[PDB]
RNA sequence: GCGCGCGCGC
RNA sequence: GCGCGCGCGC
């Protein structure tokens, strides 16, 4: 259950030596438990391995809050027998807080890394090597401009500038290390030097001696890919559409500020991404007009789902769905708009019927299905079959399908001891899973895996996804034989190369642009304001002043609230031209100021001595004379 | 808002 | 580079 006693297992023990031995390690190892037991493993050992009159300091680097927390309960839960001292620190805590006092009073630090970056960017802590060990977790995240090589950056400024300061010992965990863009074993082995350069880790391990026993926690099933199509014409999603559009004017006319409602544009019936714009619009809506909305809305939902059902099952299946929902409110409460949209309905409901029972309409998905389930089940009867699907309501319809079957009669379905196939949407000893038109993709012996889709892309990059899973394994097969020392030394040329651009690559100061400019909105070029009016907060976010501004833009109210360095996200910002409605920015309030902070991305700055337009989407980017705020 | 990473198109 | 998205963090 990950929270208490347990006894390690081989293959962990194995994993855990090269850190123990005290080498930077990265620790390439399947998904879960595995990990986690690991690092407690080896932090345990490291303050362990002390002697008398010496203390060692891990920190521990997770890249999402959810991660944060479960490791930083874990890692308290499983030291607090032991008498150590273990806190984390996060977004939410850092706001005000001593920092060089926590880590000076801790035995192990739980970190989010944007926390230290920022930290060691102040010098508020001097440097690494207050630390004795380092963990990434997810390390393979160490590249391009990510905190964690930030972290790096600063470590490897520290060794290789020739100056100490002694260092942490570094580990990273992953379940697979990557190979970038590599297109051959060649440079995915290069890929995967200059990942380990990056972490200075001199070894990767990964489970060699234990493969019997890893190789039986963590199937990894067999892997099939089925291609198939959809119908040669769907003439019911024809009629559904026209409903939904009809049903959308209608709410449109009732509602008017219908489109402002989300920015969620260019939406496509019978996609999961309109499942959103419906809920996003209906939790948007801030009241007899929202009331009006809430009944539309909940039509276009079921018109949706409908869509969904005919596309992956049978038209018979997603008529039913409908049939049922139009039923459940002819048997009240009944109002005006609902008689209305249902006698809209009632109107194609002789055709939808006719398009339904048309021979030619049948699912040529499920035929293929079909035959893979004929397929498995004549090699074994005794299969126990999982079976993943997009929608609650397709869940139903697969069900249904299956139920009224002569061609697979020999099923016994169940949903959400007996039963030998179930249905899903969410959620192992199983031994058929198949992932019919599923998106998606997210989560003993003998076991097999089945995806279908329509989709070419999906099963392409898929297979991309195998290609490059072989690349990285033989590449690690193969620098797991080089000599430690050979390795340590190319680790310390590149190294040394990136070091170096990161010097060269960097520019001087940049001399400032006095000229007052005009800020232009980027989508309709009419006039927003003056640079002259902007002003600068924190040295990294930008606000204009004054109620020449105060009415050039309109406030949506944000559905996403947070604060982060001080002050409240309260609303987006917008263009107020009708058509435009262009996305400036947001509204905060900032001390005792409600105030606009502006993204020069949506905007085209113009010269006004010269009328040159130039387009920025950093602040970094756009050297004016900005000027800091206060009184005003 | 800022920062970081990833995908799609051109 | 521009356009349009996703997820994440301060
Ligand atoms: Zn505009």
Redesign the pocket.
Same mark, same amino acid.
């Given at each position: 259950n990950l929270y208490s006693p347990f006894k390690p297992r081989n293959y962990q023990l194995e994993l855990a030596l090269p850190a123990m031995k005290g080498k930077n390690t990265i620790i390439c190892a399947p998904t879960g438990c595995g990990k986690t037991f690991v690092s407690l493993l080896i932090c345990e050992h490291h303050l362990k391995k002390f002697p008398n009159g010496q203390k060692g300091k891990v920190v521990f680097f997770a $890249? @999402? *809050?959810?991660? /944060?927390e479960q490791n930083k309960s874990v890692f308290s839960k499983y030291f607090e027998r032991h008498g150590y001292r273990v806190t984390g *620190?996060?977004?939410?805590?850092?706001?005000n807080v001593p920092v060089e006092q926590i880590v000076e009073n801790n035995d192990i630090i739980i970190?989010?890394? @944007?926390?230290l970056? $920022?930290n060691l960017k102040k010098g508020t802590i001097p440097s690494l090597s207050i630390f004795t060990l380092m963990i990434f977790d997810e390390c393979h995240?160490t590249?391009? @401009? #990510?905190? /964690? $090589?930030?972290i790096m950056f600063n470590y490897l400024d520290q060794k290789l500038g020739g100056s100490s300061g002694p260092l942490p010992q570094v580990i990273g965990l992953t379940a697979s290390v990557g190979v970038?863009?590599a297109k051959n074993t060649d440079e995915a082995l290069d890929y995967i030097c200059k990942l380990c350069a990056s972490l200075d880790a001199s070894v990767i391990a990964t489970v060699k001696h234990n493969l019997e026993e890893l190789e039986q926690v963590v199937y990894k099933p067999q892997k099939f890919f089925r291609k198939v199509e959809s119908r040669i014409s769907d003439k019911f999603k024809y009629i559904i559409a026209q409903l939904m559009r009809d049903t959308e004017s209608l709410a449109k006319r009732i509602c008017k500020d219908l489109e402002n409602l989300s920015?969620?544009?260019?939406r496509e019936f019978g996609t999961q =991404?309109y499942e959103?714009w419906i809920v996003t619009v209906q939790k948007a809506c801030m009241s007899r007009i929202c009331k009006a909305l809430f009944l539309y809305t909940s039509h276009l939902r079921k018109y949706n789902d409908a869509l969904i059902i005919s596309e992956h099952a049978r038209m018979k299946d997603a008529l039913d769905y409908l049939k049922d929902f139009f039923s459940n409110v002819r048997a009240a409460g009944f109002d005006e708009i609902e008689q209305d949209l249902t006698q809209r309905f009632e109107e194609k409901l002789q055709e939808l019927e006719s398009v339904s029972r048309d021979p030619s309409n049948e699912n040529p998905k499920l035929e293929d299905l079909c035959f893979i389930l004929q397929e498995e089940y004549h090699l074994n009867p005794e299969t126990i079959t999982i079976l993943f699907v997009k929608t609650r309501a397709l869940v139903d319809a697969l069900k249904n399908w299956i139920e009224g079957n002569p061609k697979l009669s020999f099923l016994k379905p169940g949903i959400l001891h007996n039963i030998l196939i179930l249905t899903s949407v969410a959620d192992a000893q199983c031994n058929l899973v198949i992932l019919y038109e599923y998106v998606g993709n997210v989560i003993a012996r003998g076991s097999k895996c089945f995806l279908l889709t329509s989709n070419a892309?999906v099963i392409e990059?898929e297979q991309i996804n195998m290609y490059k899973e072989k690349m990285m394994n033989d590449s690690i097969l193969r620098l797991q034989t080089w000599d430690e020392a050979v390795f340590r030394e190319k680790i310390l040329h590149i190294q040394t190369h990136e070091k170096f651009i990161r010097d060269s690559q960097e520019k001087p100061k940049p001399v400032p642009d006095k000229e007052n400019k005009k800020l232009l909105c980027?989508?309709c070029k009419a006039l927003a304001c003056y640079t002259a009016d902007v002003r600068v907060?924190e040295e990294? #976010? /930008?606000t204009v002043l004054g109620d020449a501004f105060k009415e050039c833009f309109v406030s949506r109210p944000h559905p996403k609230p =947070?604060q982060?360095?001080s002050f409240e =996200?309260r609303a987006?910002?917008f263009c107020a031209r009708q058509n435009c409605s #262009?996305? +400036?920015?947001?509204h905060?309030k900032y001390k005792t100021f409600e105030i606009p902070? *502006?993204? *020069?991305?949506?905007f085209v700055v113009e010269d006004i001595a010269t009328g040159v337009q130039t387009? /920025?989407?950093? +602040? =970094?980017?756009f050297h004016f004379e900005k000027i800091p705020f206060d009184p005003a």
């Open positions: $890249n @999402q *809050i959810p991660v /944060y *620190i996060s977004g939410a805590t850092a706001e970190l989010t890394p @944007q926390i970056v $920022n995240n590249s391009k @401009q #990510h905190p /964690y $090589n930030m970038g863009d920015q969620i544009q260019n =991404k959103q892309g990059k980027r989508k907060i990294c #976010h /930008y =947070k982060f360095s =996200k987006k910002i #262009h996305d +400036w920015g947001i905060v902070v *502006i993204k *020069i991305e949506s387009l /920025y989407s950093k +602040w =970094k980017d």
